[PDB]
Amino acid sequence: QRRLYDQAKAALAKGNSAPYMASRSALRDYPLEPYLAYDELTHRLKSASNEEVERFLTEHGDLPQIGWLKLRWLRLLADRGDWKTFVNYYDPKLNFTELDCLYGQYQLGHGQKAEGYATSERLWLVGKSQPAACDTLFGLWQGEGQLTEEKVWKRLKLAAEARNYSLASHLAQRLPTLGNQGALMVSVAQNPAQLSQTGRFSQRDHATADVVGLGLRRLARQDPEKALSLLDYYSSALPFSSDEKVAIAREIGLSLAKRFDPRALPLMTQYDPGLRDNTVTEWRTRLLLRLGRWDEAYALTRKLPQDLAATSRWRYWQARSLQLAQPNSKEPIALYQKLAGERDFYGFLAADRLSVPYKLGNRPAHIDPRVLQRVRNAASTRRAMEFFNRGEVINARREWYHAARLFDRDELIAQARLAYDMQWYFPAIRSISQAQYWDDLDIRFPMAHRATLVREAKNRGLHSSWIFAITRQQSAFMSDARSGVGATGLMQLMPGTAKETSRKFGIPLASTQQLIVPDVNIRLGAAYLSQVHSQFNGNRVLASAAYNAGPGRVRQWLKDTRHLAFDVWIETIPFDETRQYVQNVLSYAVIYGQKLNAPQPIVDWHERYFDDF
Ligand SMILES: CC(=O)N[C@H]1[C@H](O[C@H]2C[C@@H](C(=O)NCCS(=O)(=O)O)N[C@@H]2CO)O[C@H](CO)[C@@H](OS(=O)(=O)O)[C@@H]1O
Numbered sequence: 374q375r376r377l378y379d380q381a382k383a384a385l386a387k388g389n390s391a392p393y394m395a396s397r398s399a400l401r402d403y404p405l406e407p408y409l410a411y412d413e414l415t416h417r418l419k420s421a422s423n424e425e426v427e428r429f430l431t432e433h434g435d436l437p438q439i440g441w442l443k444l445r446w447l448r449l450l451a452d453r454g455d456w457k458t459f460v461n462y463y464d465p466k467l468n469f470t471e472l473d474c475l476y477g478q479y480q481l482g483h484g485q486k487a488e489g490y491a492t493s494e495r496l497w498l499v500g501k502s503q504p505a506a507c508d509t510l511f512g513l514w515q516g517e518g519q520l521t522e523e524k525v526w527k528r529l530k531l532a533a534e535a536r537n538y539s540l541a542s543h544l545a546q547r548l549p550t551l552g553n554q555g556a557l558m559v560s561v562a563q564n565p566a567q568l569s570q571t572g573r574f575s576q577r578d579h580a581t582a583d584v585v586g587l588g589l590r591r592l593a594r595q596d597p598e599k600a601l602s603l604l605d606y607y608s609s610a611l612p613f614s615s616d617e618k619v620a621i622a623r624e625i626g627l628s629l630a631k632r633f634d635p636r637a638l639p640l641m642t643q644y645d646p647g648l649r650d651n652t653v654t655e656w657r658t659r660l661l662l663r664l665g666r667w668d669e670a671y672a673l674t675r676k677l678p679q680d681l682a683a684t685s686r687w688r689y690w691q692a693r694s695l696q697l698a699q700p701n702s703k704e705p706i707a708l709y710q711k712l713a714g715e716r717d718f719y720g721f722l723a724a725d726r727l728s729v730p731y732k733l734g735n736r737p738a739h740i741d742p743r744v745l746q747r748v749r750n751a752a753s754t755r756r757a758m759e760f761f762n763r764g765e766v767i768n769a770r771r772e773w774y775h776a777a778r779l780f781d782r783d784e785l786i787a788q789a790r791l792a793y794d795m796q797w798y799f800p801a802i803r804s805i806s807q808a809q810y811w812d813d814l815d816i817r818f819p820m821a822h823r824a825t826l827v828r829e830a831k832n833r834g835l836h837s838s839w840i841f842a843i844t845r846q847q848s849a850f851m852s853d854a855r856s857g858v859g860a861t862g863l864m865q866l867m868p869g870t871a872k873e874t875s876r877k878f879g880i881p882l883a884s885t886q887q888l889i890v891p892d893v894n895i896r897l898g899a900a901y902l903s904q905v906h907s908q909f910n911g912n913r914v915l916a917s918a919a920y921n922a923g924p925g926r927v928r929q930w931l932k933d934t935r936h937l938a939f940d941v942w943i944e945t946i947p948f949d950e951t952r953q954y955v956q957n958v959l960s961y962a963v964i965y966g967q968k969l970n971a972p973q974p975i976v977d978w979h980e981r982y983f984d985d986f
Contacts, residue, residue, distance in 0.1 A: 378403060381395075385412045393409045404759045411433070414429060414442075415445070437772055440467045443467060444469050451478070451479075456479050459475070459476075459479060460479060463476050470496065473496060474506040476492065477493050477496065480492055481510075493511060493514035493519065494524065496511075497528060498524070499531065500534055522548060522549060529541055529544040530587060533558050534562075541562070545558070554578075557574075558583070558584040566596070568592060571610070583617075585607050589607065589624075593624035593625045594624070597625050597628035597632065600621075600624075600625050601640070604621060604622075618644065622641070622643070626641040627656055630656040630657070633660065633945070658670055658687075659944055661673065662941050662944060667697040667698035670690070671698055684719075688711070692708035692712070693726070709727050714732050716733060716811070718975075721959075721960060733963075735815060736812045736813070738786050749791060757773045774800075786808045788804045789801050793815070799850050802816065802850070818965060822850075825895045829899040833903035835903065836913075837969050842958045843920065844895075844898070846954060847864050852889045852891055861889070862888050868885045871888060880896075913980060915931070917955045918930070918955050921950070921951055921954045930942075934985055938981070943956060960975070
């Protein structure tokens with residue numbers, strides 16, 4: 374039959390359970406009946422029996438919200454001292470530090486002392502504040518004299534590293550002998566420029582070295598030049614460990630490398646000769662490439678660890694660095710040929726270097742129909758389907774992502790097709806991606822809002838493929854996207870920029886919260902794109918970077934250049950987020966250019982070289 378579960382649901386929310394108890398007998402078959410049961414139990418959880426709660430965890434353990442019930446119930450079980458039942462259901466995988474701390478309590482009061490100390494210490498050595506349950510644990514741990522000054526000092530270091538200075542200071546006022554360098558550590562953490570006064574930070578002991586090390590690492594981000602200078606002093610004056618020294622060299626090296634200062638190269642080379650730090654090894658190479666030092670670059674690309682050497686990046690850059698070093702050599706044509714078959718950015722570059730067509734190769738995976746039925750008939754799916762038909766977007770979305778948490782590779786692809794068939798593009802894109810079936814370009818690069826984008830792109834004369842690329846990279850066709858810093862929508866617009874974009878020329882924006890309309894999003898995004906497209910002479914490489922990082926940042930990254938190749942520039946973008954963002958948009962625009970039958974190379978003729986000269 375047809376069921377109105379809203380009445381039962383309405384009652385339970387802030388109230389009674391009579392309509393649920395009354396109607397429930399009718400809704401055995403209904404998919405969302407377990408949500409009512411969940412709330413009904415949850416309200417009276419304190420007085421519920423173990424047998425009932427345990428029964429509920431068996432019969433509806435698949436529910437997305439089940440972890441919250443386990444947290445609420447285990448609080449009580451531990452509060453009651455029912456530890457036998459606690460440990461039967463305690464799960465580290467839930468990632469509740471309150472439970473982990475309660476589990477530590479159990480270990481200490483039940484003979485597992487070694488494991489209680491390991492648990493306590495692991496939860497202690499953490500630069501943020503922990504739940505009040507942990508104060509209880511840390512109390513017991515301290516009570517057995519395990520909270521040594523070293524371990525409070527070590528957490529102090531982490532808290533200052535985390536910029537949580539209230540915590541850090543509270544820990545500093547708990548140091549019996551080291552209270553002076555604790556206060557000093559928080560001072561330096563707040564302003565590491567104070568290390569200019571070498572006289573004041575010259576007390577040759579381990580703690581002073583700990584603070585100067587923290588300071589040099591922090592100072593490296595803002596004034597690497599000053600830090601490099603002070604390292605030379607402080608390494609004589611203070612008893613730095615070798616591991617402490619490489620961590621300083623890392624941050625100074627990386628910070629100088631990102632400013633294209635060649636003084637990083639002797640430092641990086643001295644302190645990581647083994648190439649043990651990927652990020653240092655990559656930026657050493659990136660830096661050589663920026664300086665036109667093709668010989669050293671190539672040499673370095675031949676020494677890489679196996680996990681860097683496997684990537685399409687350093688395969689491309691081994692070939693290209695050799696081709697720049699020895700232009701008349703043919704060894705690169707082979708290297709590019711291995712790589713030009715891949716469908717990624719560097720694979721497109723390789724093909725572009727040979728002047729051969731790209732390999733897109735849309736080959737939708739063929740699914741076992743039995744697997745398609747198993748996923749379709751799973752209760753988590755039925756529930757997600759129902760929430761969709763009802764119009765509850767977040768609930769349908771949550772059920773989808775929770776089910777995907779433990780599906781195998783076949784089951785994830787099966788899931789992804791079903792979502793695609795319902796014109797629900799983002800969860801299809803998401804599910805197929807975590808299956809790692811990359812070759813279904815129909816699912817991964819859908820034509821959502823094609824009528825809009827094609828027209829908008831003609832307005833503010835742009836390539837249809839490039840607008841499609843930007844959106845797909847920015848949201849993956851989820852209008853509901855809110856960023857970790859507040860950029861929202863199909864074209865992840867900065868709320869502070871969105872207003873300014875609406876004010877600058879602009880047409881009516883009707884609030885930040887009500888920006889979610891795709892059609893609101895699209896013509897604004899086209900306008901902003903054209904603005905930056907214009908700002909950088911129609912260069913999509915630069916313009917794409919400006920979109921995600923700001924034109925002022927891109928200008929700083931173009932500073933003092935002269936005939937810089939496009940591929941080197943992209944590679945030598947300081948920000949990881951933005952390097953990938955550009956490489957994605959450029960690749961996605963190749964793929965959309967195909968699917969829109971308006972072929973688009975990886976870069977246009979006029980994008981290949983640029984400078985601020
Ligand atoms: C459309 C637009 O104007 N974009 C603006 C961009 O906004 C980004 C941020 C990212 C984002 O939110 N990232 C989150 C990362 S995380 O921390 O959550 O993981 N998503 C947006 C586009 O990609 O921020 C810049 C910072 O000044 C602006 O430069 S400016 O010169 O105008 O100021 C750009 O103008």
